[PDB]
Scaffold this active site. Structure first.
Site, PDB file in Angstrom:
ATOM      1  CG  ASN A 171      11.266  -9.918   2.655  1.00 43.07           C
ATOM      2  OD1 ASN A 171      10.957  -9.825   1.464  1.00 43.07           O
ATOM      3  ND2 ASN A 171      10.747 -10.835   3.462  1.00 43.07           N
TER       4      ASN A 171
ATOM      5  CG  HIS B 156       5.567  -0.051   1.069  1.00 41.62           C
ATOM      6  ND1 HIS B 156       6.705  -0.783   0.799  1.00 41.62           N
ATOM      7  CD2 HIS B 156       4.848  -0.040  -0.078  1.00 41.62           C
ATOM      8  CE1 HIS B 156       6.673  -1.199  -0.455  1.00 41.62           C
ATOM      9  NE2 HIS B 156       5.556  -0.762  -1.009  1.00 41.62           N
TER      10      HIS B 156
END
EC number: 3.2.2.29
Lengths: 215, 76
Positions: free
Chosen positions: A28, A39
């Site tokens: 997650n 990210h």
């Protein structure tokens, strides 16, 4: 002013396209990753550093470059659980796995890279049913159902990973991933200098990790 | 000009094993080491048999054998 609807929970969109060589899969996205909209933002994670020290990226990249990875490097990103909530349900992992496998069966990357044993252990039991006995890092004896997608497992890129305290302790897996990637595409790299093995002393590694931290 | 394995041992307890051709300059091994370790070549010194390794030496030139070990020190 007029209208106050800013919610706490936020979702970091996947970065997936068809024909990718690699797809990095996490459990997650962290809170900052969701809020920053990229990210593996720093600090506290070794992903981008490992990507460079392994030679998977030409220069040192960072989270801001994540959207250029599919096109320039053939790399994408996704996660077991899509929503990021500040501050782990069994059902979530159940429904999560189904959705994950579905995305993989759709985009079918050449290699599914599991960021951490935990994510793979969960995925393995839910998709393959197997409980995985004595899991080993690297290529696994399973392909994503209904695909030719390989499963590759590496230690968690999070600095929180205790078994491998430093980015340098994880790089070897990125190097072997690069090797696998090359072999799959028919890229003939130079075999002049090959890294055969990396061995480290845990105690010294975690101490060294601490020193590097304070600095 | 066959391949041989050389280990590079640092002061942090780590040991990296490389496979390299006997006539390949060690400069390439030293650079690969620095890159994978995320270290700058400026602050690193490699030694073999108590002798500094220059940029043009090759395993053959240094009469290195399979599984020989190179010492590395961080000039920090």
């Amino acid at each position: 002013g007029v209208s106050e609807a800013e919610l706490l929970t936020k979702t970091l969109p996947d970065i997936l396209t068809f024909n990718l060589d690699i797809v990095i899969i996490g459990i997650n996205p962290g809170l900052m990753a969701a809020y920053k909209g990229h990210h593996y933002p720093g600090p506290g994670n070794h992903f981008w550093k490992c990507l460079f020290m392994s030679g998977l990226s030409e220069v040192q990249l960072n989270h801001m470059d994540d959207h250029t990875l599919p096109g320039k490097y053939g790399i994408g990103f996704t996660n077991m659980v899509e929503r990021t909530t500040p501050g782990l349900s069994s059902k979530e992992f159940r429904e999560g796995g189904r959705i994950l496998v579905q995305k993989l069966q759709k985009y079918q990357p050449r290699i599914a890279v599991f960021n951490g044993k935990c994510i793979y252990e969960i995925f393995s039991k839910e998709v393959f049913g197997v409980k995985v006995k004595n899991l080993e890092f690297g290529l696994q004896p399973h392909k994503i159902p209904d695909t030719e997608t390989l499963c590759y497992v590496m230690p968690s890129s999070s600095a929180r990973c205790a078994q491998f305290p430093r980015a340098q302790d994880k790089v070897h897996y990125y190097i072997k991933l690069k090797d696998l990637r090359d072999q799959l595409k028919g890229i003939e790299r130079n075999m002049d200098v090959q890294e055969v093995q990396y061995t480290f002393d845990l105690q010294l590694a975690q101490e060294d990790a601490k020193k590097m931290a304070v600095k | 000009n066959d391949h041989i394995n050389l280990k590079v041992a640092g002061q942090d307890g780590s040991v990296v094993q490389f496979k390299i051709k006997r006539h390949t300059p060690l400069s390439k091994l030293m650079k690969a080491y620095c890159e994978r370790q995320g270290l700058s070549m400026r602050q690193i010194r490699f030694r073999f048999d108590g002798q500094p390794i220059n940029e043009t030496d090759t395993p053959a030139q240094l009469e290195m054998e399979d599984e020989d070990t190179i010492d590395v020190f961080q000039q920090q």
